[PDB]
Design a protein around this ligand. Structure first.
Ligand code: A1BD1
Ligand code: A1BD1
Ligand code: A1BD1
Lengths: 710, 710, 237
């Protein structure tokens, strides 16, 4: 934060000479000076360089409308106007609202003006930094000696070791110096919500539109467990989105809570849809309660919003219609919903208090904002017993939190404020929409096959596009209207191989091949389904990366159409079993995988296996407890029918839990088993494309076993 | 890792000129060249500078015994010997074991030799780095574009924001680039134990003398919960060290397990002692089982080793005598026990397998080794199911672990290998013993009071000093012999105020005042008791910090004897309450606090309140569950008699759990309440010295409330 | 207050190189380095030059009795001893009373050592300055704009005039910036005996062996009249 832009070349010595002296004095104060040629140049510099901490210009040449243009980009950026002919009578109230400091031209005044500019820069830095992060940085500047944990003592231990010194050089001194503990009393305590931490929490709650907020240093998995434990005592009944992250299943294995499942939808691609509106109704829930043994009226409900693939619920209807006192929106994938009006009504914290209810949002700050991994947030709107919640919170948080992760959470909040933060979010959305339109254009002008994008036909303006029953782009049958919306940030590209009616074509390109090719060429996809690839167009994606992705996709298409050899196209895959992949070409491998998928009818089996719910014989807690008592046996996959499962079976694809612990496959649930059996067969043909079934175990002979209650 | 030491300053051109040319070629390869004057200079340079990655010397001048001296400090450090008169007939087998590369003197050969030296330096770096850390650094070098989590996309998002740019500049590019997720498939996965992670685990298990090891990214609190939930199914009975960290209490609030408590000892200072040997016997455990409702034979036992204050058990006796199939040593404070023989037999992993038993050690790598906060280890010796354990493991681990924390755990392992790691650990131990002896010598030379150190008289050799019944330095009554040992790393200093027989003196200096003074002068203590201060002499403490601490202590003594004013002596304390601390001198404040402690007889009440166990009406799980059901009321302290506590009461001092959830205070447990009441009174006389009682809540009228079962 | 004396000229790279790096880092922190040839040279340098604010020496070459000789001339002068062979066991209680800070020799440690030395120099300056003077200097550093008396407003009026500029150049900027009034509330008030002024008075009374002391800005003539009029009412002898 040390770049100062000087805008003029004035042609009079009485201005130029003081400006040259000021240049020298500022450089003595450790500033880097840049010289834009004109106002458009300056505005571009500001747009492209966030380290620009100040602008100097001549008030005679440029009016204060230049300050208005600067402030529209960054309302806190200090601007220094040098006055010669203008006086106090030439400024208006609106002008005086801007962060402008006025100086005059004089020989010998460079030193005090530079001192004033240094003070203003420090004030700018202080204004944009959040309280905890500022306190941490100031403590580091103090350079105190520690005889307390952590044992590396501000990085000293690393410097005394060869390999430690390599680690220290990689991560840098500041990262080590800022790794501290609650022995440093001036920073307060996260667990006690004291000092700067308290301020941070309030800061976050204000930025994220929450009544209360909590920083979590072990991910949204831990955040979910905190919320669930506070909300669902033992013996209670909980409504669970069947498209729940396995953290919720872990919570159920930990606490003796009886689940009743919301049933979401799916399309032919295996992309998860939303829970239909009828599942939120009182009568449906009551009937399910009546049929479920040891079930009562639910005290807590958990809904995944958004889905992994970017489908958001209209949350106003859910908050109105779900007759449960506590509603928890697992919003891991959408921590940005408060920072753009296009998400209004599509997030848990949207709007005000719901009478008689408490709404939680759990957000993964590290997933789609800028924070270190494991940084997570809990947002609460509604009445809670603060002390009991604090107990549930401390039960899952370490007594030695990583201060860097905490500071990054606060800093993500700070990055979201003001004109600069609005530009960040809006720019990310606009970039995603431009990329989507470009994919559509390239697909249109492609002579043969090209990548498609999963979206409505005519996207024009930045918004969350509704899923409507008439349109068939989304592939969901008989979907409720004004219910599901697509987040433009989450871009799903489709490889050829599936027809528009839900069947698969004669030829196809499985998306795993494309993801491997992209990895070989320096591009990492978020995830890959059978014929879809997910790309996150977050605030960390710039034009360079998007254009590079387009170039990589066209390169893959050209290489595939030339039918290159796997040894050349995919060398790392070839290094897996070089004997198998000799003289094997790309089109043959792709067609073999596609024909294996088709012959086994993978889409129909995947769809049917997730449409029938396996029978719940005991809650996951009881089954897990019996597994802890060593009362389970490993049996083969063909014998699952009638056996109570001890473990969650989570297959990829589609990447969502298929069997929960305590559930039993009956005859009416046989397709589940068939699907799994199928995943075994297809997984045993091409190295590098192995089966991936959590909860199943590959034996030495190549068969698969599962653990069941003995 | 780019410093090369060139030793020789010879007198012949045919050697000098090639060495000059080599200097130039190496500097072209980005090496920094240093020029020791003699062999002792070189050895000191190696000793003090871990970034020295190579040594060049003339074989004619120096024999290869120099290489032996170099290897004794770092057996991997590359050494380059230039041969002129010596030949292949002049090297022995032992000499050839050293990491020596031989070159010759020739004009024009500098480029080839420099290339060879660069290759050897890369080989050195590769050999000392652990596998996961090496893989992570190589991935970062690849510079790939990510469209996956985390959202900051290798730090790009921070660079787009002003405040983000400040954060990025602070933590540095590499820290952001190495923050990745499992979308990067080449690093494998922590949860799946795949790829480099698997190698890391095995590496760690080999280094720490464990059959199996697990990396934990949410601290030893989470490690304890993983071990406990795997080992103690619902309805089981667990033996718990009453000096347990609150993480074990959290586990008990999670799972419906019945505790039976080991009773440790304590001295007049409030320093926790060890569990006596009689508590480990079958008859005592059986008798306690027969008198606890719904108790069975324990399936799991948890012992804190060491204590916070550095007391280690003879763990061979515990392993032999405790008739429980699963024994978990919460070894958070002693992750270094495998790296010095003075800890032999004093840690959980010492020795071999125990027949019919599984032994766990949970270690806080970040506490006393060099790792980022929240980095923790689980070490297993014995048979485990290994699949159920993996379930307990993943149910407490986030799906987005912080790769920096994981890599720091692995690197902490790597820092412990070889001559360099042995020198690290031995140097820390000897440094601590030197500091202890110096405190004793200064206390002897002092005319008047001086700080004491809690240790036996006449410590001579580096070892864990036994606690014996005949000696009274430790202050424990009728302690068993060959049972408890003091860790020299954990240095406890004592302020005047207590007599040798357990009573307290007429004058004293409470240790909080000294800790505040040390904080004001740039020194952070680990923790403070009423008259004791704990300093960790870890591998991160060097001579500079130890001498600084000695100067700070003597400065405090001189300032106290001059009877300085609080406004000057302790500016932050005075700023806490400027009206109260006006014209108050330091001696008056210290004596007021001392007399408050004396009049209430703090040590006797502290000792008696922790000698009688409050009655266990029901296990902490049931009490916490009905707290979640809203079935608790807030009552006042004088009304706890007969009320089942809903929350753990954890007072500082002595900083260990006083009341567990589900426990009740009866007539025989009245002193507990008295102690707590006393703490309240004590905290209501001096701003900056407030009461600290976890589980109690200060009302607006100055009273304290606790939550109890209705 | 920016001169640092570095005593040693040793013969080992592992000490020489860190000292050279430290010299560069200190000069980057606006220190002037001087190089006495021997201990007698250093002691004369201290005796003759009150701006010498610090001494760096090698503990191996010189024992801490050198610190005793330094302290006998200035007990507050910071001394920085570089330890190689000596340890915590080599310092006595009397030695620890001296204003000595201990460092070690290492490549790449010049920046943090220089920062520590800068902090120690600021502490030395702060400890020898009296309270009111320190407050005045800190206020001048703040560089506030005044719309209050005196009318020259920190010397600005002098700079706007030719003859005023001559006067300002003669007396210097600091003398003009420090000419303030009681509108600056943070300095307290002489007439009210408030804030730093109060501290100053007590400081003076302690130094001059008086129960109470008063500063007078119109000479001992005015001091005499104050004492006399308090002591001698009309009609007295
Ligand atoms: C809906 C939902 N709720 C909570 C969490 C846990 O949040 P944390 O991971 O912060 O504990 C996740 C995590 N989802 N992440 C992926 C793998 C990681 C991403 C790879 N680029 C998964 O596990 O399926 C979630 O999807
Ligand atoms: C015996 C024992 N077992 C486990 C843990 C949890 O280990 P983690 O903190 O890694 O989750 C701690 C933690 N104890 N640490 C101190 C605070 C230290 C911070 C100041 N240097 C405390 O909590 O009292 C423990 O003592
Ligand atoms: C005994 C005695 N009491 C008070 C004062 C007033 O003290 P102030 O002058 O601070 O108001 C003076 C002053 N005496 N000073 C000389 C001239 C000095 C200048 C030439 N070097 C005089 O007046 O004859 C005194 O002698």
């Amino acid at each position: 934060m040390n770049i100062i832009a000087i805008l003029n070349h004035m042609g009079v010595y009485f201005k130029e000479e003081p400006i040259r002296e000021l240049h020298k004095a500022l450089e003595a104060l450790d500033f880097q000076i840049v010289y834009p040629n004109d106002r458009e140049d300056l505005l571009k510099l500001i747009d492209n360089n966030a380290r620009l901490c100040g602008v100097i210009f001549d008030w005679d040449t440029y009016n204060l409308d230049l300050c208005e243009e600067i402030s529209a980009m960054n309302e806190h950026l200090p601007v220094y106007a040098f006055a010669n002919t203008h006086s106090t009578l030439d400024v208006s109230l609106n002008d005086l609202r801007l962060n402008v400091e006025f100086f005059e031209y004089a020989l010998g005044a460079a030193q005090d003006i530079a001192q004033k500019i240094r003070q203003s820069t420090d004030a700018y830095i202080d204004e944009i930094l959040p309280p905890l992060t500022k306190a941490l940085f100031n403590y580091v500047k103090e350079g105190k000696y520690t005889f307390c944990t952590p044992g590396h003592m501000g990085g000293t231990a690393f410097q005394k070791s060869p390999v430690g010194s390599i680690f220290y050089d990689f991560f840098g001194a500041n990262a080590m110096k800022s790794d501290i503990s609650i022995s440093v009393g001036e920073l307060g305590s996260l667990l006690d919500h004291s000092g700067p931490h308290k301020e941070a929490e309030e800061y976050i709650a204000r930025t994220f539109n929450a009544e209360r907020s909590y920083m979590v240093t072990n991910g949204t998995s831990t955040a979910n467990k905190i919320v669930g434990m506070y909300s669902a005592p033992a013996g209670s009944t909980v409504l669970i989105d069947r498209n729940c992250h396995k953290s919720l299943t872990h919570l159920m294995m930990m606490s003796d809570i009886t689940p009743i499942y919301f049933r979401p939808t799916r399309n032919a691609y295996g992309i998860l849809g939303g829970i239909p509106k009828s599942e939120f109704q009182h009568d449906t829930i009551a009937e399910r309660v009546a049929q479920t043994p040891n079930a009562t009226w639910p005290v807590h409900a958990v809904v995944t919003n958004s889905t992994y693939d970017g489908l958001l619920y209209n949350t106003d209807y859910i908050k109105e219609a779900l007759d449960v006192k506590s509603i928890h929106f697992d919003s891991a994938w959408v921590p940005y919903t408060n920072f753009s009006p296009i998400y209004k009504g599509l997030c848990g914290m949207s709007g005000g208090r719901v009478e008689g209810k408490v709404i939680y949002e759990t957000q993964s700050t590290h997933k789609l904002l800028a924070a270190f991994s494991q940084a997570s947030m809990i947002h609460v709107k509604g009445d809670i017993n603060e002390e009991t919640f604090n107990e549930a919170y401390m039960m899952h948080t370490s007594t030695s939190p990583h201060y860097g992760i905490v500071a990054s959470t606060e800093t993500a909040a700070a990055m979201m404020k003001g004109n600069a933060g609005k530009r960040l979010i809006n720019g990310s959305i606009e970039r995603a929409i431009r990329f989507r339109k470009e994919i559509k254009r390239l697909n249109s002008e492609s002579e043969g096959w090209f990548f498609d994008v999963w979206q409505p036909e005519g996207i024009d303006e930045a918004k969350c596009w509704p899923l409507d029953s008439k349109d068939n782009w989304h592939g969901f049958k008989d979907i409720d209207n004004d219910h599901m919306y697509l987040d433009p940030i989450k871009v799903t590209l489709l490889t050829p191989g599936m027809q528009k009616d839900g069947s698969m074509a004669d030829t196809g390109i499985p998306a795993s091949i494309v993801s491997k090719y992209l990895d070989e060429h320096g591009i990492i996809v978020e995830k890959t389904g059978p014929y879809n690839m997910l790309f996150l167009f977050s605030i960390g994606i710039d034009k360079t990366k998007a254009l590079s992705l387009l170039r990589a996709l066209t390169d893959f298409k050209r290489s595939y159409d030339l039918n290159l050899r796997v040894k050349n196209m995919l060398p790392s895959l070839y290094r897996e079993d070089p004997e198998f992949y000799e003289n094997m070409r790309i089109q043959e491998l792709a067609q073999g995988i596609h024909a294996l998928i088709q012959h086994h009818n993978l889409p129909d089996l995947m769809y049917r296996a997730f449409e029938v719910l396996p029978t719940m014989v005991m809650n996951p807690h009881a089954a897990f407890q019996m597994e802890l008592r060593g009362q389970t046996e490993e049996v083969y996959l063909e014998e699952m029918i009638g056996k109570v499962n001890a473990n969650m079976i989570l297959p990829y694809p589609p990447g969502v839990p298929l069997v929960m612990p305590g559930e039993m496959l009956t005859e009416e649930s046989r397709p589940v088993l068939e699907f799994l059996q199928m995943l075994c067969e297809i997984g045993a043909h091409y190295p590098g494309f192995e089966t991936d079934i959590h909860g199943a175990y590959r034996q030495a002979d190549g068969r698969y076993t599962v653990k069941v209650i003995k």
